[PDB]
């Protein structure tokens, strides 16, 4: 449901073949919140509940609203913790293809995560989405250090937080058919460009 650590939890010597890591919005529960879930359950239909390891960070991330107003959009501890995740993949399953995604601030969460990784790990990233992203605007719409091509953003006219502000008006929660739909499929797809099928 809203809590995945499918990572965390799973078997070194039967790792599965794609690890998606996710952050939720700010005060969202469990470790996928609102729209995590429904990416899950479309990532699981197209490689199989075997075939992916779904991961949501939790830990230090505590989706603090206020944490916001950061530099970075987010706190210095949940970056430690996103950037934990994505080491602990790299380690576990080595040849597993990584995909990653984030919602608000953990949409900004996400993007500075990635943008600090060691390039080799960043690497293995085949695809980011990101939902109301925070510094859509600041970053011109891409992540730093990570390619356009693999980078999708679902921004909504409206919603203020893609266009430089933090006030949270309706649009910013509307991702829903997003997550439902163009957000799996875009994954599923950079998926499948390098890993075939």
């Known amino acids: ?36 879930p429904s990416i899950a359950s479309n990532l699981e239909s ?3 509940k ?3 390891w779904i991961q949501g960070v939790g830990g230090a991330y505590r989706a603090t609203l206020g944490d916001n107003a950061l ?15 994505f080491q602990q993949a790299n ?15 953990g949409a900004a969460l996400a993007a500075a995560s990635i943008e600090d990784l060691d390039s080799a790990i960043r690497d293995k990233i085949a695809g980011c989405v990101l939902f109301g992203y925070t510094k859509n605007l600041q970053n011109r719409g891409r992540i730093p250090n990570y390619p356009a091509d693999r980078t999708k953003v679902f921004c909504n ?12 008006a ?11 739909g163009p957000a799996p499929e875009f994954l599923i797809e950079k998926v499948r460009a390098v890993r075939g099928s």
């Open 157 to 168: 006219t409206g919603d203020l937080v893609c266009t430089g502000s933090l006030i949270v």
């Open 1 to 36: 449901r809203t809590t995945r650590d499918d990572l965390i939890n799973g078997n070194s010597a039967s790792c599965a073949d794609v690890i998606f890591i996710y952050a939720r919005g700010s005060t969202e529960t469990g470790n996928l919140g609102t729209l995590g």
């Open 71 to 85: 530099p970075r959009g987010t706190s210095s501890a949940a970056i430690r913790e996103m950037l934990g995740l």
């Open 46 to 48: 197209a490689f199989g």
């Open 170 to 180: 309706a649009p910013h929660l509307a991702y829903g058919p997003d997550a439902r």
């Open 91 to 105: 380690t576990k399953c080595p040849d597993a293809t990584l995909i990653a995604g984030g919602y608000s601030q």
């Open 50 to 52: 075997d075939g992916v």
